Amino acid sequence: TQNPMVTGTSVLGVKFEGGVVIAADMLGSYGSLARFRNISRIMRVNNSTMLGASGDYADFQYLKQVLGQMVIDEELLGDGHSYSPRAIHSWLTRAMYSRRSKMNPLWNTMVIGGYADGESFLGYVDMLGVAYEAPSLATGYGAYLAQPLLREVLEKQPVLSQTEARDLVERCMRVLYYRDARSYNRFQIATVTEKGVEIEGPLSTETNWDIAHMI
Amino acid sequence: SRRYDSRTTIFSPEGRLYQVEYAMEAIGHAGTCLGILANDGVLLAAERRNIHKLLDEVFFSEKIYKLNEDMACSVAGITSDANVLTNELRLIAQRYLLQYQEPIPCEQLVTALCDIKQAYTQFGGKRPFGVSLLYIGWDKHYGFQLYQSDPSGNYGGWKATCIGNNSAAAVSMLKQDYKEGEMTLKSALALAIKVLNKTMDVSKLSAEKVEIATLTRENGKTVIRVLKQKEVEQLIKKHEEEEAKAEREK
Amino acid sequence: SYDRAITVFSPDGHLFQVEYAQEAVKKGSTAVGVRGRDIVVLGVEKKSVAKLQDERTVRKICALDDNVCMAFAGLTADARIVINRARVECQSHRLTVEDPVTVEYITRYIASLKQRYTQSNGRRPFGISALIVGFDFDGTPRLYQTDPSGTYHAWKANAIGRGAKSVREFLEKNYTDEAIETDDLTIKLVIKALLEVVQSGGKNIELAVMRRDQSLKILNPEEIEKYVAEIEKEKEENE
Amino acid sequence: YDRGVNTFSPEGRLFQVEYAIEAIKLGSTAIGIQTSEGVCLAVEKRITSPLMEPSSIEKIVEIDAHIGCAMSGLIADAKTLIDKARVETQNHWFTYNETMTVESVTQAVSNLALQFGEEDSRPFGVALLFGGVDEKGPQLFHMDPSGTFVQCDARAIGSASEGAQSSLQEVYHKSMTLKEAIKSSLIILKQVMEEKLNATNIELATVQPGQNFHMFTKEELEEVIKDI
Amino acid sequence: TGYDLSASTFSPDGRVFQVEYAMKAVENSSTAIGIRCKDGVVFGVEKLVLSKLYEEGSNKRLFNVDRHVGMAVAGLLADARSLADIAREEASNFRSNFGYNIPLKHLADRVAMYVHAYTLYSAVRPFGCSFMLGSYSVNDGAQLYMIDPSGVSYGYWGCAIGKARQAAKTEIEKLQMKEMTCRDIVKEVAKIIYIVHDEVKDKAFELELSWVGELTNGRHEIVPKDIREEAEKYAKESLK
Amino acid sequence: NQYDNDVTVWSPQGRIHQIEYAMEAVKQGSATVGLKSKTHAVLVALKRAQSELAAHQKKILHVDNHIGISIAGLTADARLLCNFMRQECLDSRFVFDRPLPVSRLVSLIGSKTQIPTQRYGRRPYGVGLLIAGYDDMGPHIFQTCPSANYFDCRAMSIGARSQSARTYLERHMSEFMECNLNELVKHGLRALRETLPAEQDLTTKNVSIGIVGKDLEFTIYDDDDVSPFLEGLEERPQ
Amino acid sequence: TTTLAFKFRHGVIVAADSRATAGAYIASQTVKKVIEINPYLLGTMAGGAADCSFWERLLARQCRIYELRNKERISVAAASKLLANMVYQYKGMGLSMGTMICGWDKRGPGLYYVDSEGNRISGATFSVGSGSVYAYGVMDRGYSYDLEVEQAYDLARRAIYQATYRDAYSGGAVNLYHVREDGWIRVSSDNVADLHEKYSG
Amino acid sequence: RFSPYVFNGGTILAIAGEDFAIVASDTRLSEGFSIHTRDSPKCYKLTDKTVIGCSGFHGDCLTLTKIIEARLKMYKHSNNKAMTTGAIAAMLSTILYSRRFFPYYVYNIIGGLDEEGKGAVYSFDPVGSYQRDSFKAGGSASAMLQPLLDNQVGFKNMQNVEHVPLSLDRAMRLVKDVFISAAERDVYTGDALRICIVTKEGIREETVSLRKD
Amino acid sequence: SIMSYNGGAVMAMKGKNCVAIAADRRFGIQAQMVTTDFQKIFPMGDRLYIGLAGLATDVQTVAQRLKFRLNLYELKEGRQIKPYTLMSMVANLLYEKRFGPYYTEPVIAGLDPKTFKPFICSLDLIGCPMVTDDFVVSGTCAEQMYGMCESLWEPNMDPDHLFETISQAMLNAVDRDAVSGMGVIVHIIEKDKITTRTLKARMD
């Protein structure tokens, strides 16, 4: 892919006590045009891991097709094994690096949140094969805007509960609605626990416009 | 898969070949040809195996295959096995001319064919060629030349030759009546009429059953001559006159 | 594409096809060759000309380079592929390393070519056995031989063809260094040895020498009459 | 009389590789002995004619500077294996700057000992002895056309391979020295060959940790015969 | 004889014995039966314990091709795992190209052409396997198919593969099949296995049961086997 | 007998005899015994010697940090499947960054050995692989065959006179779950000693033991550290 | 980077500097630029360091196999011919290699010059590098075929010193080898800062 | 267009001791003007006696690490032993040259003990050349660290300064001082300083904090 | 341009019962001549020639590839080649190198092998045939050659005035050209004989 046609935007993610919460919005844009107002940008991998992505959306449907097949392939064996969230993060890194080595990359930026064996996992995947782990991740302009809000609380208090982490994402998604030119007031929140993967509905923020009277 | 193979590649338990000897005995039947040079010019003798009176004979050319502006050949064996070889050897002589812009010498053209005929005997189990043939030609290095070919890929230089099994007795005549450089081109022609008189068991040597093609050197043209049917007949009547003349001593 | 093996093992532990093609070498004409200290010599026998035909095309002694000379047995067509292959390799060796080709190098090329030509699938072996004579740099004359198995092998005198062991038995009682002293005596040595071959009436003997500083020079059919004359004169002193 | 090249026996073994072991029996004999001081090695040339040049027939062929070889069987089939074993040691040094060990040489050799077939030929007909000195001291190994690779203390193969191995078990122990093992080997050689022992019938090859190469010019050979 | 070597030569009366030989090679294996109710398909495979020979749960002949498609193989064992790898591979390409679940009618046809392809050439042999195909869909119903080593593939309401084939299908038709729910059929299939195969041949045998249908939401899985245990209790009421 | 030549040709009885001949090639190799506890998996092998001066041919070989295999039969088919075995372990280590579970690796072997048992001009692999290792759910003992029928067993033995080796196992298979390593190993080598003539057993030159455990990488012992295991044995009765 | 090589009555003298840079930054001062191939051959380094280090190491692979097959050491003109053919296959792809080949041969001394541009010339004196032109002038003023061993050492030693003094990229230490008939031998390895005090007075 | 390269940062230091080897690196992984993480060490324990450092483009660093880890296992199953320090450096040079016309963008330093228990440091380049040195510093802050160790460890440009061998404890405070001065002037030098010490008894790790700006 | 690298000019003209063809003699590289004997007209059988102009590589290359296919055609058949058959043969040979084209423009002149009927045609560098009834021209100095033949050609002309018309057409057009000159050779063929003359041109 040389030119991304229909693109996504920033995706957030942060660990908490016994789970990882990931939120992203529901807009696909073609340049300055907000063309597709209602799409899903979060894929629920089987039971303990979870994927969101930015960048080109047509490439995201391709990886949604491939990863969806591989999970079915192990379940049909039925030997009592599964892919860990780290193994998918390891697999997806080699997929990106081999793709860019042929000078024909996949224009994406992917965030993997997982929770297995009582361990919250949060992994980053770049288009250029750059991958790491972090207690809080942000893509796009969220790495410029929401990422200072994430690291400020986590360096003050390292651990978080579920309600503290869920409220803190809604504050960062509010800020991205103000300062990002290509955002939208309709987002969905996905959360892994030990009970499984649950995806919330099309939530929205509440803005403040009291400074408009100040000339 | 494995029991259907014919194994035309293994040697004989005697320690020789086994399939080529079967092929070389087909050449002796179905055809009889020869050629003779001793001076400027060279002839080729042919024989009509099928002489039925409902053929067209509209090719106006025959077993003499003019493969070059300086060379031709006379073939005997399986008939359309030659048409693979004549079209192939015609193009070897022509790709040489593309490479050098100079006509092909008669020696190394024969070596090009004999490497092809050997290659089916070396490897594969492909059926080998049941084809032996002759060569006539002029070059810048030795002039007029004759060459015999074999199905085995063997060749050699000759001055009087043989193909057919009936012409094995002609070799006994060619040892008896050959000269050393006295080929006036009537003595060479009356000898060839004398050979095919005794060898070919068809009586009186009808002019339609045989064929003669000659190659003479012009100033720079190398005229290849396929002589017509009228002058065959006066050459036969010349040879019949010499037989009636020579029997006067008895 | 022909995926079928020709040469396999026998229950007694031998190969069929290698010891099955050496009889074709035994049905060829004989050609012997010795070496001196300065002039090598090799002579084919059994010319068997048709006495009215050409002879410059039935040559059984050729050269790969200006150093190396050939002589073989077996069938005619298989030698032509091996010779025209080895002319390419000895000339491509000079395109590499700029020396002339040593005579031991070209025998390893032929024997390795003939070995994989039996190891592979769907391929008849060759049926020839060559003599390779050369006097390389430093001027040391030596000769080798081949085999349809592909074993290069250095001798001081060789005999092949139909009647090889009889001529080798003649040289077996002929180990004299005095015959390798004079050059014309060494040529008369081969002419006496080729006289033990079939009829050898001075006409079927085609010999060729090389004085290690010159290309191969075939003796004319007058020195063959001259050397057979002095061999008859040397045989007359038996009384 | 024409069965498969790739077919098991009804008893269950094989067809053709069993015949390959029989092909070793018609070759000349060879003796190699591993000592704690080094590896000595011996072979018989089997001279046919005095017209034949003797040094053109070799059995000891160097593989690397510290690894020798010994062959018995079909000659030019062994020449394929020698040329590969030389190359694959050079691939080892020009990718690792170290010498390939004596065991790990034969691992690469015995991979295509049994790879004959149609896609992707016949099995080979030579048995080999590999001596050499490496970081585990001097070593000695033995292989076969069936790819069965093993380490031996003192293996003897060839036509007289049976009577050699029986006599060798009498005279061998673990605390041998070098020159004691050298003259003990040729005593076995003159019992198993038919010609008189001289400077032309046999040849030796002795590799040491100190004397790092195998170095057996002639007339050292006559020095040992006059001392026995 | 003389005509039965390759699979590319016809007999002088008009058939191929290499296919005929491989059919009764399937006959020497143990009994695997299959049946469908009005809202599901029930599988049942007798498995023989020789002396110990395995940890129980080894090499079960009830494979799992797709989420809604199951196997019940018999005959030779190693080639059955090869056909399972073909059928899993075929259902993935239908998913990738066409974007929905594979119908069982096509999945039978694509496999049976692949089985047919090894009956035409001398380079390969025919398969020595035979199996079943069960599925369920709310837009289609419950379907049950059957493939011989020759490649004939069509439907059944019930079938049996193994040594006990004709003796095992005599009591299958004695049942009612239309009005039954498959949970009733689970304890029915237990007794057909338990009636046949007296312990004179083999003393130890063991029963597997696979089960796809409307209760399983279309997904294929094994029965709760150690759970509820009404297979063996209701089967051993055949004492008289 | 004429239909007993190629792998492709079926029998008129329906038994391809080329596979049945390859089962005989496994019975010519030396015996070996593998078994497992709840928490450990130990396989014990027996070596042979070609001569007195020759070293003993090794049997157990390391593959991965938890998978190690035993061998029986040919040696070309040994190393040819071994190079395929080491290759597949480091691939999923390179791709997924995790060790392979033992069960689905063996399914790759049955797919690997399937093709030369069906096409023309290809022998089956005469081989006797006993496989031990950990997946995430404990020890496993697997065995293979040239017919490619892999078996999830708990204790088996393959090779020459393993008939007597199996008989010792079922009369002590109940003990093979609660006991720890010191008697788990010497339960196993009590089974090898009936695969022998009655005058030699285990004299520190012909036995090797490989153990894989929970906190234990797959470790091979040979003839010097085997000597702590070879003490505390009763002799054979008569 | 400055190397030179010249042959005379008593063999071949090879000298080089030891500085490898990176733009305006000096990577190291102790780079051994004269690559030792055999006990009887020597190679140099010019331009691309990894290009000269790889292919001369690959050239040593072929020379060792040639000795095992032919029971003879390779000749000097042979090794230069093999190196020219390997580099020609990558012509136009941007290889930097201007090395020299030195060694004793059966025909006497041997000195050749191989470029990455397919150049293969023989000769008597050569000088390769960015500061090579500063070495031609001082050497040709002092060169003779009939020199002594101690004389030829001091000529090549100062010639490297005059190059590094003028050039910016050349510097470090002066390595000095001597190719003799039996084989090469290391002479010395001198620092430029020590030579500066020697040639000051 | 799609440019396949980007710079990430990091700084690697190695010192060949008399019987030890010290490898140090920071933990900042940056890109452009932003910080991805503050915990990303560049130390990698290859064997018990060899630690490698990898800087430059991070996507090639993850790839090149996993290639070497496979070939260590391929060596051991083929040769029944482990690689030495110099054998890994000889192997790595062919791997880096194997992509000559599409190179890695990775600066490599291998430190560790030899087969005699002495410190060996091998520096590298993104195309494949290497040499053995006493100390090298690679990465973004490589120019701010080379001339200082020339004064301290190399004892250059000092009159009447003796040549004492560097002890272990003196080498520890030399490493801890240079990364403080590097963090003041470089923007890529991060927070945690992972220090690996390879002795003849094992590998010890140690983490020292720096300024967090 | 690439066509103007060596230059040249080929002209053919149809007469009453005869046909004439002519070309120049100069071989040069862009300013610098080399020789005056570069052949550009090649015989293809009797009473049928061909002329080539453009890049001198493709002049010598195509004339040998066409001769390669021609001798194979006249040996598979017994007859000679017809002029329409040759035009289809050349148009095949140029179109095969559709994207790596030969830089030449052929001109074919000849008679009927049965009657006295003449034939002229010219082709593009990729192989579009074009038959006329009066004249065809090719080369760098094309526009000067159109100005001659549009003002001098007459329909029914004896072989004498046909020679005088094509001579004045070449000598006035090529002397106006810079990179072409150094002599003009003229072939005038008819049913019974072939006449070849060389004209007296400006050698500057």
How far apart CA B136 and CA B115 sit, in angstroms, is 19
Element (H, E) at H193: strand H192-199
Under 8 Å between Cβ of F148 and F172: no
> Residue ranges of the alpha helices (H) in I97-154?
142-152
- Is residue F135 within 8 angstroms of chain A, CB to CB? yes
- Is residue G64 within 8 angstroms of chain D, CB to CB? yes
- Is residue G63 within 8 angstroms of chain C, CB to CB? no
Residues of D in contact with G68 (CB under 8 A): 62-63, 86
Element (H, E) at I83: helix I83-96
Q: For E87, what's the count of Cα atoms within 13 Å in the CB-facing half-sphere?
A: 32
Q: What technique solved it?
A: cryo-EM
Give the closest-approach CA distance of H58 to chain A in angstroms. 6
Amino acid at I8: G
Pairwise CB contact (< 8 Å): H127 & G48: yes
How far apart CA B167 and CA B134 sit, in angstroms, is 14
Query: For chain D, what is the total number of helices (H) and then of strands (E)?
Result: 6, 8
Under 8 Å between Cβ of D94 and G60: yes
How far apart CA G1 and CA E190 sit, in angstroms, is 89
Those residues with Cβ within 8 angstroms of residue D135's Cβ, 6 or more apart along the chain or in another chain: D101
Element (H, E) at D191: helix D178-192
Residue entry with tokens 């005599």? E170
Under 8 Å between Cβ of A53 and A60: yes
DSSP G116: T
CATH assignment of the domain containing E43: 3.60.20.10
Identify from F8, F19, F23, F122 which residue to disrupt to test chain E contact, counting E C-beta atoms within 10 A and taking the largest count. F8
How far apart CA C174 and CA I165 sit, in angstroms, is 91
Amino acid at E189: V
Pairwise CB contact (< 8 Å): D98 & H87: yes
The 3-state secondary structure of C37-95 reads CCCEEEEECCCCCCCCCCCCCCCCCCECCCCEEEECCCCHHHHHHHHHHHHHHHHHHHH
Report the neighbours of B using a cutoff of 3 or more CB pairs below 8 angstroms. Answer: C, E, I
Residues of C in contact with D119 (CB under 8 A): 3
Residues of C in contact with B108 (CB under 8 A): none
- Is residue B3 within 8 angstroms of chain C, CB to CB? no
Residue B104 sits at the vertex; the CA angle it makes with B99 and B108, to the nearest 5 degrees, is 105
In this complex, whether A and B touch, counting 3 or more CB pairs under 8 angstroms, is no
Those residues with Cβ within 8 angstroms of residue I119's Cβ, 6 or more apart along the chain or in another chain: I19, I83, I84, I108, I109, I110, I111, I112, I131
Q: Which of D25, D26, D53 sits opposite C156 (nearest CB)?
A: D53
Identify from E85, E93, E95, E220 which residue to disrupt to test chain A contact, counting A C-beta atoms within 10 A and taking the largest count. E95
Class of the CATH-defined domain I1-204: alpha beta
DSSP F100: P
Pairwise CB contact (< 8 Å): G81 & C98: yes
**Domain extents in chain I:** 1-204
Pairwise CB contact (< 8 Å): A130 & H8: yes
Amino acid at F201: D
Those residues with Cβ within 8 angstroms of residue F7's Cβ, 6 or more apart along the chain or in another chain: E125, F16, F18, F19, F116, F117, F118, F119, F120, F122, F123, F124
Measured from the Cβ of residue F126, the count of other Cβ atoms closer than 10 Å reads: 25
Strand boundaries in chain I, DSSP class E = 9-14, 19-24, 27-29, 32-35, 41-43, 48-51, 107-111, 118-123, 129-131, 135-139, 184-189, 194-198
Element (H, E) at D192: helix D178-192
How far apart CA G166 and CA G159 sit, in angstroms, is 11
Residues β-bridged to residue G14: G5, G177
Considering only alpha carbons, which residue of chain D is nearest residue F6?
D7
Element (H, E) at A85: helix A85-100
Would you name the residues of A annotated as active-site residues? 1
Total of domains in chain E: 1
Under 8 Å between Cβ of E162 and E169: no
DSSP C180: G
Give the closest-approach CA distance of D95 to chain H in angstroms. 6
* Distance, first Cα to last Cα, chain C: 69
Strand boundaries in chain F, DSSP class E = 32-36, 40-46, 61-62, 68-69, 130-135, 138-143, 151-153, 155-158, 207-213, 219-222
Q: Token pair for residue F214?
A: 């929970």
Considering only alpha carbons, which residue of chain G is nearest residue C93?
G78
Residues of F in contact with D157 (CB under 8 A): none
Residue C79 sits at the vertex; the CA angle it makes with C74 and C82, to the nearest 5 degrees, is 140
Q: Which of D95, D104, D107 sits opposite H91 (nearest CB)?
A: D95
Q: Which domain holds residue E176?
A: 1-240
Considering only alpha carbons, which residue of chain A is nearest residue H39?
A134
How far apart CA C37 and CA F172 sit, in angstroms, is 85
Q: Token pair for residue B142?
A: 């030795």
Q: Where does chain D break, by residue before each gap (C–N > 2.5 Å)?
A: 120
Q: Which of E64, E65, E92 sits opposite A69 (nearest CB)?
A: E92
Torsion angle of C-alpha atoms D80, D85, D86, D91, degrees rounded to 10: 130
Q: Token pair for residue H105?
A: 């963008």
Pairwise CB contact (< 8 Å): D62 & G68: yes
Amino acid at E100: Y
Those residues with Cβ within 8 angstroms of residue F30's Cβ, 6 or more apart along the chain or in another chain: F45, F46, F47, F48, F59, F72, F159, F160
The candidate with the shortest Cα–Cα distance to F190, out of F39, F41, F44, is F44
* Neighbour-count burial of F66, counting CB atoms closer than 10 A to its CB (0-12 exposed, 13-18 middle, 19+ buried): buried
**Chain D residues 148-187 with a CB less than 8 Å from chain C:** none
Long-range pairs for D1-6: beta carbons < 8 A, 24 or more residues apart: D3/F5, D4/F5, D4/F6, D5/C5, D5/C8, D5/D116, D5/D122, D6/D117, D6/F121, D6/F122, D6/F123
Those residues with Cβ within 8 angstroms of residue B108's Cβ, 6 or more apart along the chain or in another chain: none
Angle between helices G149-166 and G133-142 (to 10 degrees): 150
How far apart CA A117 and CA A82 sit, in angstroms, is 12
Size of interface E-F (CB pairs under 8 A): 79
Pairwise CB contact (< 8 Å): G49 & H129: yes
The candidate with the shortest Cα–Cα distance to I194, out of I18, I25, I63, is I18
How far apart CA D94 and CA G65 sit, in angstroms, is 12
Write down the catalytic residue from G1, G2, G3, G99: G1
Q: What is the largest CA-CA distance in chain D?
A: 56
Residue list for the binding site of G: 49
Angle between helices B106-122 and C76-95 (to 10 degrees): 110
DSSP D64: B
* Neighbour-count burial of H93, counting CB atoms closer than 10 A to its CB (0-12 exposed, 13-18 middle, 19+ buried): buried
Report the neighbours of D using a cutoff of 3 or more CB pairs below 8 angstroms. Answer: C, F, G, H
DSSP G84: H
Residues β-bridged to residue B45: B34, B212
Identify from G19, G26, G54 which residue to disrupt to test chain H contact, counting H C-beta atoms within 10 A and taking the largest count. G54
